[PDB]
Amino acid sequence: VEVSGNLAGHSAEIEQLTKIEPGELYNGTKVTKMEDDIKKLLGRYGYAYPRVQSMPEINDADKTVKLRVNVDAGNRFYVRKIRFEGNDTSKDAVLRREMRQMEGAWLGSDLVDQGKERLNRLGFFETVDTQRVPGSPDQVDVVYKVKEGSFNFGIGYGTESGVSFQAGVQQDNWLGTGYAVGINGTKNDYQTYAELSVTNPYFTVDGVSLGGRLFYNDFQADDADLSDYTNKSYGTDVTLGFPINEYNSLRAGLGYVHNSLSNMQPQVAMWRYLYSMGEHPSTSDQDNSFKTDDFTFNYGWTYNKLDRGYFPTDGSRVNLTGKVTIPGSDNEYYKVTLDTATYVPIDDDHKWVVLGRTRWGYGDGLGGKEMPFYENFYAGGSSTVRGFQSNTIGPKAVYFPHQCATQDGAKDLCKSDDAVGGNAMAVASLEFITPTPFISDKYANSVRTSFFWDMGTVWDTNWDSSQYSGYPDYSDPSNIRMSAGIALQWMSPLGPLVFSYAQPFKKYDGDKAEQFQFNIGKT
Amino acid sequence: CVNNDTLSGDVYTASEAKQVQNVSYGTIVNVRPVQIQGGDDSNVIGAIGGAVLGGFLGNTVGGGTGRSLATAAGAVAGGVAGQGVQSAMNKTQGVELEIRKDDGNTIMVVQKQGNTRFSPGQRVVLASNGSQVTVSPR
Amino acid sequence: CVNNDTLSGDVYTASEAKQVQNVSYGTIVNVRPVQIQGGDDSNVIGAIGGAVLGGFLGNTVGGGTGRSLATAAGAVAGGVAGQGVQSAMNKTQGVELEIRKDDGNTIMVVQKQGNTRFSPGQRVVLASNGSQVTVSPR
Amino acid sequence: CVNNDTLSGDVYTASEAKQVQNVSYGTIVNVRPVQIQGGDDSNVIGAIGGAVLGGFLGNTVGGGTGRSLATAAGAVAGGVAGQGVQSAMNKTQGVELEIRKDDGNTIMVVQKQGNTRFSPGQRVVLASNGSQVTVSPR
Amino acid sequence: CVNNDTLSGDVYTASEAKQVQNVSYGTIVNVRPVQIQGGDDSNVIGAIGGAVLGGFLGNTVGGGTGRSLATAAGAVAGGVAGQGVQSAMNKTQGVELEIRKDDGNTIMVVQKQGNTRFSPGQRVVLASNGSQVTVSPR
Amino acid sequence: CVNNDTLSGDVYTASEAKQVQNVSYGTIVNVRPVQIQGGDDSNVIGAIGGAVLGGFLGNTVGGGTGRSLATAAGAVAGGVAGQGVQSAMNKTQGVELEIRKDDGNTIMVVQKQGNTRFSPGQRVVLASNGSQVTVSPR
Amino acid sequence: CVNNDTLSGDVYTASEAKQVQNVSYGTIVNVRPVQIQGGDDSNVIGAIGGAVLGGFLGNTVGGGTGRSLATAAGAVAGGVAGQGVQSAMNKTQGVELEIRKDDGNTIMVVQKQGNTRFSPGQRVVLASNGSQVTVSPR
Ligand SMILES: CC/C=C/CCCCCCC[C@@H](O)CC(=O)N[C@H]1[C@@H](OP(=O)(O)O)O[C@H](CO[C@@H]2O[C@H](CO[C@]3(C(=O)O)C[C@@H](O)[C@@H](O)[C@@H]([C@H](O)CO)O3)[C@@H](OP(=O)(O)O)[C@H](OC(=O)C[C@@H](CCC/C=C/CCCCCC)OC(=O)CCCCCCCCCCCCC)[C@H]2NC(=O)C[C@@H](C/C=C/CCCCCCCC)OC(=O)CCCCCCCCCCC)[C@@H](O)[C@@H]1OC(=O)C[C@H](O)C/C=C/CCCCCCCC
Ligand SMILES: CC/C=C/CCCCCCC[C@@H](O)CC(=O)N[C@H]1[C@@H](OP(=O)(O)O)O[C@H](CO[C@@H]2O[C@H](CO[C@]3(C(=O)O)C[C@@H](O)[C@@H](O)[C@@H]([C@H](O)CO)O3)[C@@H](OP(=O)(O)O)[C@H](OC(=O)C[C@@H](CCC/C=C/CCCCCC)OC(=O)CCCCCCCCCCCCC)[C@H]2NC(=O)C[C@@H](C/C=C/CCCCCCCC)OC(=O)CCCCCCCCCCC)[C@@H](O)[C@@H]1OC(=O)C[C@H](O)C/C=C/CCCCCCCC
Ligand SMILES: CC/C=C/CCCCCCC[C@@H](O)CC(=O)N[C@H]1[C@@H](OP(=O)(O)O)O[C@H](CO[C@@H]2O[C@H](CO[C@]3(C(=O)O)C[C@@H](O)[C@@H](O)[C@@H]([C@H](O)CO)O3)[C@@H](OP(=O)(O)O)[C@H](OC(=O)C[C@@H](CCC/C=C/CCCCCC)OC(=O)CCCCCCCCCCCCC)[C@H]2NC(=O)C[C@@H](C/C=C\CCCCCCCC)OC(=O)CCCCCCCCCCC)[C@@H](O)[C@@H]1OC(=O)C[C@H](O)C/C=C/CCCCCCCC
Ligand SMILES: CCCCCCCCCCCCCCCC(=O)OC[C@H](COP(=O)(O)O)OC(=O)CCCCCCCCCCCCCCC
Ligand SMILES: CCCCCCCCCCCCCCCC(=O)OC[C@H](COP(=O)(O)O)OC(=O)CCCCCCCCCCCCCCC
Ligand SMILES: *C(=O)CCCCCCCCCCCCCCC
Ligand SMILES: *C(=O)CCCCCCCCCCCCCCC
Ligand SMILES: *C(=O)CCCCCCCCCCCCCCC
Ligand SMILES: *C(=O)CCCCCCCCCCCCCCC
Ligand SMILES: *C(=O)CCCCCCCCCCCCCCC
Ligand SMILES: *C(=O)CCCCCCCCCCCCCCC
């Protein structure tokens, strides 16, 4: 080595911070690092500009390289003002933390080089650009510059609801203040969702996030293979949200829902519920309007670890959510939904992938009253447990003789096999992802496939078998439903695609099946 | 219960063990007592911990609508008390020490109170690192 | 039960085995006893493990809304006691060693107490690495 | 069960076979026994393997509400014992060697105990590589 | 079962067939026997293989709750025995040789035991590659 | 059955037909027979084809719960034997040839044994590419 | 069906048309027959194709569990035989040619046997591209 210049106190530490072993040949990395262990440090001596540049005498005859490290130190310059122009929403506060020299401190260009870049990960700048006090040679600034509502239309097709539309306007900057306002609208066989939504991501300067949701879920049952009941429901929820980890979050809020239960196909499973609340209309005729207004408190949690957003095969994803009313509304209940996700890659080459998503739920009515039936859990279908028709798993209802009708001589509980759902849900599925063959091996690493063994068990936690002999006890703890098969998912300029074929191997009588299902657009 | 129990001259964290730290000497002037704050300003946890406990306490009084009002007044009162007691349980007794290094200077450093009772005029050693300094006696 | 058993001179991590690391010599002055903290500042696991067991101990008393109060008060008390007890299974005894190297210097290094008792005035060998140092006696 | 078994002077990983690695020579002093901790500090795999076995063991006493308390306290005690017992099946004997290379220098290296027993004064050959060194006798 | 059968001077991988190999000459000193390991630290596949087979044996004792406990205790015991057995079918006998090249140097290389028997002093013909070396006899 | 058949001097990959191959001439020394491995070290395909055929061979015995034990023990045993038998369907004979080019050097190259039988001292016409070498006898 | 059909001198791919190819001249010696293996290492298309067809041929025997046994043994034997036949329809005859360019050199190249018959001693018009060559006879 050699030192030629004023280091202000690193003159001897060259062989300790910037050392190599003699005999090592001319390197552009392990000799430049000798330059670059004192090129960044010197902003810890208040020195603003640490300059290290070393130009050896490249000697070839008997091959020694005599390094000559001209290090001249900077000087002690300070942090007066941080100035952003053109942007009416970005703050001088968060755009200080995402840089690494606070206001009122010894300042340097080279040790603010740890700050300028991360400011762009806000997701709203196109560029993130980067002063001695104007005409005064001691105090100094750090400055930046920034360069800164699109419709969207969705049309899909499918098996669970066939046709499917989306259309809504998003504008993630309300007049220059960072509020995220977004609208959405979806229509298909059973529900039509037309929602407005707002958010302020920084309620507190430190991260608290407040969203107020105005939704409307004009739903319908018969087209969705269930039994008969119609729902036009409107409600509004508001939730807080505060970051805690960047691997976590948390939320809490107050949620008011209002439902119009009507047009019910008389049947025991819901007619237990009507009594306990206090409504007993005619037991075989369908002109009845049960109205609920539920206020309900809600909360959640989250976790993210995946490395790649698109076609992810790493990390671990989690979710929790619960809910409970105050005991001062119409129906009183609570609800607990847990979610999981895990993409385990076994080696760096990343062709073997392991995935399995566990989900749990449970609900109950508190003071002896019952969970509303439209809030139950449904299992079986394409998106959760492939092979069995959508919703088809869940202890079936029992139609009354209504107008099972008295024209044919119906005078009892006509046993039915129609899916209704349930209140305790548990779905596991272990999936074992494998390479993509049969296409050119140049690009045979894209179109994903997997073999899967999906289970699903919803039951009525309060269903009776004292009173129903000829029927089984529909609360069996191990009435599992496994299935297997295949399916191919990928990207193409016509949206998200997948095609499937899954054989239902295990099931019980009364459990329908659906071997084949597809997805284009959205499901 | 934020753990600011590492801010004494008699406790070290895990991250600064088995590492080389310089030694500088000095004498001491002007010890005086001072309190130390440690934690956050939002106190996002004490608020919830006081809020649920003050909220469930509402469900004990009244009935009908009179209950559903007390179960919110109690909730915000518990919310206030949660921060009012969490951030008053992070106070710690401590000291503020002027020292004159033998190198010729004077510096100030502040520490949590421990067992030893310093004096104005004594020899104390500065186990120095990259901008963390602990003042042990002798 | 975070494992802070690597902080002595009598245990090595697996990432410091089968490696070349230099040796310097020195003598010892001023050994004094010190406690060593470790691990997390938040104790997010002790909080959960305390909250659950504190909640399930609230279900055992009362009936109705008198129970539903206890099943939350117990939860908060268990949540606090969790952090309270977890940050008590990290207190580990240790020592603070000041040593004069033969090059002519002085440094000070802190290290978990083991079996051997260092003495005021002795010879120790400094096993050095990329800014990691362990002190072996003899 | 972590396998810190390749840290011996007697077993090589399959990534270090059929390779060219240099040979240096040296004499040896200062042999002392030291333990080796291998694996991760958090040690999460044994936490589940203790929590579940201590949770199902909680379903064996009492009934009603008194069974939930038991099968949660047993769960957290099982988790604690799990982390406590896994990190105590990685402890492995080892040696500290202070070798003088015939160049004229000194380095120390730590290495899992095998079968051969080093001595105070012996000739060893350093199978050296990019900072991985195995010390064999003779 | 890792197929660590390719570490012989008598079995080549298909990655290095029909490829050009430099040749050097040398003599040999100090043959000695050494075990060779391979694979991963964790042995995932053996873990699950142990866990499931040790779970389905758990079901076959008792009933009610005592079955539900044993089917988990057997599960974790089989899981441990997995890693305990998988890492036992990679232990392969082998040798470690240092050889004196006719250039005038010394290197040492480690190989699987084969049919050939080496001696201390023999004209072994190196095959070299991009840092892969085999030692053939005579 | 990973296609390790193109490692002879009598079969070419389609990737190197209609390309330019340099010609060198040389004489030959010390032909010796060797085996060649090819494919994977983990043998994933044999694992499935052993696992399913060991599973469905379990179902043929017992009933109740002892059925559910054999129908997994058979699966794991088949999984082991799968990797066991796949990596024995790739052991193929071969030769190792040291050859002296007219340049004045020596190299050795390894090939799959075909039908023609080399001799100790002959003439072979090297075909060279981007580090691929073949040996034809004449 | 792997398309190794563009390996003749009488067939060109759609990428090597309407592009300029340099022309050189030469004489010819040492023509000998060779087999060309063209396609993938895995044969992962006829492997499934044989697997499915070998499966459905399993349901057609036995009854009950003895059926469900055969409906898998047929699969892997059907699966394995799939590769064994697909790799038997990628074998193609071809020739090896030692051409002397009039530049004064020698190179060799192999091709799929076409309709023309090369001979030892003739004139050929080497067509060249970005390291791609064909040998038309005349
Ligand atoms: C080594 C080998 C492997 C390990 C295990 C192998 C086992 C092998 C053999 C097994 C034989 C088995 O048959 C035993 C059995 O379970 N036998 C039991 C079994 O029969 P089977 O055999 O199954 O057929 O079941 C029966 C069910 O019993 C009861 O069921 C009721 C409802 O069910 C009933 C009904 O309404 O009556 C009856 C039933 O027939 C059916 O009809 C149901 C129906 O389902 C719905 O109604 O209804 C519940 O009332 P509810 O629902 O309305 O609420 C009731 O809850 C109740 O009774 C509520 C109780 C609650 C007591 C709270 C204790 C917590 C201490 C923490 C404080 C410290 C603060 C920091 O409250 C009371 O009872 C009030 C009494 C006043 C005084 C009590 C003490 C107050 C505080 C003490 C502090 C002490 C300080 C020194 C519940 N008690 C109960 O189910 C039982 C309850 C009673 C208390 C026992 C004393 C334990 C003291 C230890 C603490 C030391 C403190 C320093 O036992 C328990 O909560 C166990 C809880 C252990 C939790 C872990 C400890 C955590 C803390 C330790 C410190 C680290 C029991 O009688 C049998 O027990 C009995 O025949 C009595 C006999 O003794 C057995 C009891 C076992 C407990 C041992 C645990 C100790 C070590 C822990 C090990 C991990
Ligand atoms: C070359 C070889 C190739 C093989 C195939 C080729 C040809 C074969 C084809 C046709 C022949 C065959 O069909 C014969 C047959 O199946 N015959 C059977 C067939 O009838 P059919 O043919 O259809 O007419 O099925 C019927 C089923 O029988 C019983 O049915 C009960 C329920 O049935 C009932 C009811 O009452 O509820 C009534 C019934 O009528 C019906 O209604 C059903 C209803 O459907 C639902 O309930 O219910 C179950 O009780 P449950 O519900 O509560 O569970 C019970 O399982 C039970 O009760 C629970 C059982 C299970 C315990 C297993 C644990 C042992 C640990 C081993 C480790 C050693 C040391 C640690 O436990 C017991 O039964 C207690 C026995 C103790 C001894 C166990 C062996 C251990 C020995 C070592 C000990 C250490 C000391 C040295 C079950 N027993 C049973 O189903 C059988 C059970 C009995 C134990 C066998 C003893 C010797 C085995 C030697 C093996 C290793 C030893 C070194 O065995 C088994 O489950 C299989 C055991 C597999 C072990 C594999 C180990 C892993 C290997 C990995 C290698 C690396 C039996 O009648 C026939 O067997 C009998 O009439 C009695 C007979 O004697 C036993 C049967 C033979 C099994 C052995 C073969 C396995 C080898 C491995 C295969 C890959
Ligand atoms: C080399 C050899 C190779 C082996 C090959 C062979 C393998 C297979 C062959 C087939 C034979 C086998 O089938 C035998 C059998 O299972 N036979 C059983 C089978 O019959 P069949 O198969 O049909 O023929 O099933 C029958 C049903 O069993 C019973 O079912 C009841 C419910 O049934 C009922 C009801 O009342 O609700 C009525 C019934 O009629 C029916 O209708 C059912 C119906 O299904 C639902 O309604 O309902 C349960 O009550 P519940 O629902 O309310 O819970 C009850 O469990 C109960 O009640 C609850 C139990 C609690 C037991 C658990 C605690 C053990 C401690 C271990 C760790 C130490 C802690 C630090 O409590 C009791 O049983 C009360 C006993 C009081 C005294 C306890 C003393 C133990 C203390 C030890 C302390 C040591 C300290 C150092 C349960 N007992 C039972 O199931 C039995 C229970 C007996 C109590 C303990 C004795 C031995 C303990 C050894 C521990 C060593 C300690 C160092 O045994 C067991 O739960 C198995 C326990 C497994 C433990 C695994 C290890 C876990 C910990 C790991 C530690 C490292 C039993 O009669 C038969 O039992 C019996 O024949 C019992 C007999 O007497 C002796 C059996 C010994 C077991 C040895 C196995 C161990 C190896 C483990 C492998 C991983
Ligand atoms: C690391 C600290 C984590 C602390 C979490 C403790 C979990 C508490 C679970 C209590 C369950 C009681 C509710 C139902 C009671 C009942 O009688 O339930 C009865 C039913 C089964 O009995 P039936 O046969 O009568 O249905 O359920 C059970 O017995 C469920 C099994 C309980 C044992 C599971 C072990 C504890 C949690 C698992 C590990 C999670 C750790 C995750 C860490 C990352
Ligand atoms: C290595 C750490 C893994 C720890 C995992 C512990 C899980 C404990 C599961 C106990 C099962 C009892 C639940 C209900 C009992 C019952 O009567 O359940 C009833 C039903 C079936 O019984 P019937 O046939 O009588 O209906 O289900 C079962 O019996 C479930 C089968 C259990 C055996 C599988 C063994 C564990 C699964 C695979 C292991 C995963 C390892 C992960 C490695 C990282
Ligand atoms: C460390 O301290 C973690 C924070 C835990 C929060 C502590 C909350 C204290 C509870 C006070 C409740 C006062 C109730 C008053 C209602 C009128
Ligand atoms: C390693 O030391 C961390 C262990 C993980 C947390 C376990 C802490 C135990 C919690 C005890 C809860 C006591 C409840 C008291 C009720 C009043
Ligand atoms: C490598 O050894 C990994 C093993 C991980 C689990 C080891 C077994 C620990 C479980 C012990 C649980 C005891 C609970 C007792 C409660 C009273
Ligand atoms: C190569 O070896 C691949 C791994 C094959 C699995 C081997 C693991 C064997 C599992 C044995 C389980 C024994 C359970 C004993 C319980 C007491
Ligand atoms: C190329 O060779 C791929 C081959 C795919 C695997 C075929 C191997 C057959 C596996 C036989 C399993 C034996 C069953 C034993 C049952 C006890
Ligand atoms: C291009 O050629 C595509 C691949 C062709 C696949 C043909 C599969 C042949 C299957 C023959 C079946 C024999 C099975 C006999 C088992 C007893």
TrEMBL record, chain A:
Q: Where in the cell is it found?
A: Cell outer membrane; Membrane
Swiss-Prot/TrEMBL GO biological process terms? Gram-negative-bacterium-type cell outer membrane assembly; protein insertion into membrane
> Where is each POTRA domain found?
1-74, 77-148
**Which GO terms of the cellular component aspect does the record hold?**
Bam protein complex
Q: Which cysteines are joined by disulfide bonds?
A: 404-414
State if Transmembrane is listed as a keyword.
yes
Q: Which UniProt keywords apply?
A: Cell outer membrane, Membrane, Repeat, Signal, Transmembrane, Transmembrane beta strand
The task this protein performs is described as:
Part of the outer membrane protein assembly complex, which is involved in assembly and insertion of beta-barrel proteins into the outer membrane. Constitutes, with BamD, the core component of the assembly machinery.
Q: How does it assemble?
A: Part of the Bam complex, which is composed of the outer membrane protein BamA, and four lipoproteins BamB, BamC, BamD and BamE.
The entry assigns this protein to a family as follows:
Belongs to the BamA family.
- This one is known as Outer membrane protein assembly factor BamA
Q: Which organism is it from?
A: Escherichia coli
Q: What's the source species' lineage?
A: Bacteria, Pseudomonadati, Pseudomonadota, Gammaproteobacteria, Enterobacterales
- Intact protein stretch covered? 271 to 809 of 810
